[PDB]
Symmetry: D2
Subunit: 335 residues, 4 copies
């Protein structure tokens, strides 16, 4: 059994914890501690009640130095310097690094000095991380020697399962992505100073372009695609669930039904439960709280010559949270 | 206006009301007088909706109802309510052009009822049936209009954004094939909370979801640019904004190009032949900054991507206001055709 | 269910569909079987809208269309489509109670057409005409029901929130007079972007504004609590949320009271006679936390204010789900009446 | 002519500046400097483009140490310690204190040490401020000796003009207010740690109660009402424009038309242009960018016995911004 801690009990951290309990602790993981600078009773309240993900169906209480979730005593800690955290004295196998402040292999390595064996960054990592993993696509690159890895981004976890079967079975010459994306807490309600002049604008009233690294990052996960994809994001006024819209030039002629069949076979085969195959006339909220990384919408496929468009819905919080647990197991399992 | 084009609006829904607002808000720049509105609603309600709008704010002007007339900045506009266009007193009113905005008369056969009532021409504020005399994106193909054309289509808001964007690129680079997504504001064909609709996706709350919907607007470019017939297709994703939309076109160029070259082609078009129809934008703007912008296509050079021969270009458009202003442009072009 | 109450739903709009969902989502807690739905829409569309909802999420269960039946968790529900209730085969189906959810048959005279078709009783999912046999807020006055009552009203969602809130306070403090504002989620009588409506305020975009609207729900308390007849009035402010509303009642008490005393009165009622109808809340919650809550009135003790003899009490309510569950409660009470 | 500076060029500061220029500089004021920690080009961009208030109709450029607005050179400064600001060397008459960090008479007095003559706090002040002003209701309490005052809050500026004529002409025994209020930037897009557990919840999806001091603060402005009013706020998903809903026990019997007539007479008399009188069937967005403090909606009045309900719409940004300019003049004019 793998002993995990969560560094940063924000939205990502809370959703990882909820994902662990809501699936019946399918993974051989015990969350033995949370480190967060906020006070425990507020963080427990925000675990019990969420707007996007509703009420936690389990039980959460705070008892002394512990937050108790479905009977499990999770040690609460509040040290801003990771190397002083008692990870070694606590037997910590994997730190889920969810603060957003320690996204390089160097900064995230402080957890190793404090006694933890490994760290998974809940976001794209520096150039210098040991690996960048989309679980279901490249977790086989993991090795026992790795100690700081990145779990990529929500968007890369949607795109890579979509493009891998298509590149294998059809061939991707080049591609361009737009992700139509729910707003996030790096955005604002009404216009206010921001480093980025577009994210400074009300997220509730506008479509807001923003830069994405996900199309390029698929090159890390699928090296044969390095340099072949580019794109951007459009943030729109929804609280959760996003859409990858990928246009690509196929290397040979194809049809709508062949493209769809390739993805259906992948969803029943090696990408089962990571990639799903959807034919019903659904809308974005129907994928809220769906734990898949990539919900391919076969109803939206278009083919015009060699030009193909494919679209996939993803819960940009819940899919990623569940993948953090899958990657935790695969990392402790690497030889 | 004197010895002017006399127009009437059939259907005073949002499209018709926004044509009237566009005409008055630029000071009747076009040599047009709106002399009647036919609509089945209470005239006092239609007058109130002209004074106050959520998306387009308060009308800068005066609107009163005085008997059988709605008076706008002093202009007396006859208010009618008849379901059958052939019974409308268009000959009596000396109508040059009916702006047909109901959605119920989109073929030449149906719209011809206005001509029976004595109007000289009809412009459908939407894609037309296969029998219409022309389909016009003003700035792109108004030169095809002739004096013989009597029932025409002004295409759609989305086609009016796409065609100015793709015409310069096709002329300089060639288009092999292209696929469009329009990320589009919701419209009144959608719903607040889930309820019966003919379309199972538009049956779903528009305020809470991204909602795919079909649109023929990319295929329709072939009616205005015949060299592109059959080469473009696409669909729409409706999102929770009240107005302003984004055309996102991915296409395969016939030769190699670059971000800078694509942007330069569109900059030249915006400064030249497509001035005021197509604009060129480099500032870090968001969709609401194009609300109440009368251009057809506000190209956003900051978003251009090129990977191999695949190009993505994106253009913002006020899906109500641009089209409203183009209806007036096309009215003048039609009446000027020789 | 065996030797059960056989119900049908006339009108499968949101109100009717949410009754069906409420029945199945609590596992058919009530000894009721829904044996038919009459609606003019395509049954496959109505089935899809039962499986997926924005406000209430996915139905936890199965829904298929198999011939003339919609099959819900294995239960065969006959699907009908007839505009005239007197032609519906209610006698053939052994219907005990029609849940009348169309909005078109709210008087006893009109709803009596269901009785001509052979149903035994009708419950209108809305305020009734002056001729209905009873108006029921379950938990407050279901004891007035008699076996002779055949067409009744279940009042409105807002009356079902207000009456449980005010009944305990009137009993212990006395109400001289009261005025209510309900801060209310938008509904499908409103619009996404401004368009013609009979009401000039509901003609305006519901997503961008606070919109006042009339409601008789405070006056209607007098039908269920006659001692309060004529003492309460109010109106609604529609705001941009899809579901869950807030009753905000200001009233003048007949004796002096305090925040703590007011809260204690409502706590005792919630723990006693009004259990599960009225809840008592002290946690720092917001409206979405009451979405899909089946109570009629979720009193929020954190909001209580008293200044002199003026009291303000506020209660959250899922304006769809509470009422849906109460329709089922009132069905059982009506069929149990002696 | 009064030489003004803006400390804190956030939303309040930007809207004060826009209000000055959009009304044709009706007030005998020159904004001679802005002090803000953000960089000038971002703040100029956010002056040119706003979501709630649209595009500034004037011209804004940055030229060296100055932001030029409609031809006026406004000195730009970036000192976080007010006493080091060159206010004296710059002839600063009134500092409009808009940071939200200096809301006591003591903390705000740092501007006086730096050489400014007076400070107006753009929010409720400490117990210790020299005065709390709702312009149009009590600006006559101002005196030459005052050096730190508060301009109250947006909500108090809506409520006080509403209640003053009613108390004078009818009599307010007691009252309770609900303000149905647009969200603000102290709220969040999706649930995240906050000091207040209700404001920690998504402002776009819920009605969110919050505490207000405005009903009590009307006691400062109208001492005869001290202790007689209480209330709270409900934040709802709109970006701007709010509603005061006041229920009160009148001291004598009255009617809907008398209540409305009292307010109509006040809107044409002493409260002209501060209080407006509205009978059209309007909704909240129709009052966006309206510079009044209190837009009374006569269509909503209710009277049941001695119990009266009156409602007033207010642009909670624009009305207050315009009042800051009115109060600036009245403060420099006090003898
Ligand atoms: Mg002429
Ligand atoms: Mg005729
Ligand atoms: Mg000729
Ligand atoms: Mg039975
Ligand atoms: Mg029969
Ligand atoms: Mg009996």
């Amino acid at each position: 059994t793998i002993r995990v801690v969560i560094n940063g009990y924000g939205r990502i951290g809370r959703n990882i914890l909820r994902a662990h309990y809501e699936n019946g602790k399918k993974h051989d993981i015990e969350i033995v501690a949370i480190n967060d600078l906020g006070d425990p009773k507020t963080n427990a309240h925000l675990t019990r009640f969420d707007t996007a993900h509703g009420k936690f169906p389990g039980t959460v209480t705070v008892d002394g130095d512990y937050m108790v979730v479905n009977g499990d005593k999770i040690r609460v800690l509040a040290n801003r310097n990771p190397a002083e955290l008692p990870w070694g004295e606590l037997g910590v196998d994997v730190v889920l690094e969810c603060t957003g402040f320690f996204t390089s292999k160097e900064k995230a390595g402080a957890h190793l000095k404090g006694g933890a064996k490994k760290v998974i960054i809940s976001a794209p990592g520096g150039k210098d991380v040991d690996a960048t993993i989309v679980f279901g696509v490249n977790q086989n690159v993991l090795k026992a020697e790795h100690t700081v890895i990145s779990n990529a981004s929500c968007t890369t976890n949607c795109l890579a399962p979509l493009v891998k079967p298509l590149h294998d079975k059809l061939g991707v010459e080049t591609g361009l992505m737009t992700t139509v994306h729910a707003y996030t807490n790096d955005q604002v309600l009404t216009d206010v100073y921001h480093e980025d002049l577009r994210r400074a604008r009300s997220a509730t009233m506008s479509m807001i372009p923003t830069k994405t690294g996900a199309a390029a990052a698929v090159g890390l996960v699928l090296p044969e695609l390095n340099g072949k994809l580019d794109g951007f994001a459009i943030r729109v006024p929804t609280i959760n669930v996003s859409l990858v819209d990928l246009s690509f030039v196929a290397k040979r002629d194809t049809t709508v039904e062949e493209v769809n069949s390739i993805l259906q076979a992948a969803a029943e085969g090696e990408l089962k439960d990571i990639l799903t195959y959807n034919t019903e006339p659904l809308v974005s909220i129907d994928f809220n709280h769906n734990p898949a990384s990539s919900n391919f919408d076969a109803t939206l496929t278009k083919v015009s010559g060699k030009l193909v468009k494919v679209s996939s819905w993803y819960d940009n919080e819940w899919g990623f949270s569940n993948r953090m647990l899958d990657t935790t197991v695969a990392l402790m399992s690497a030889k």
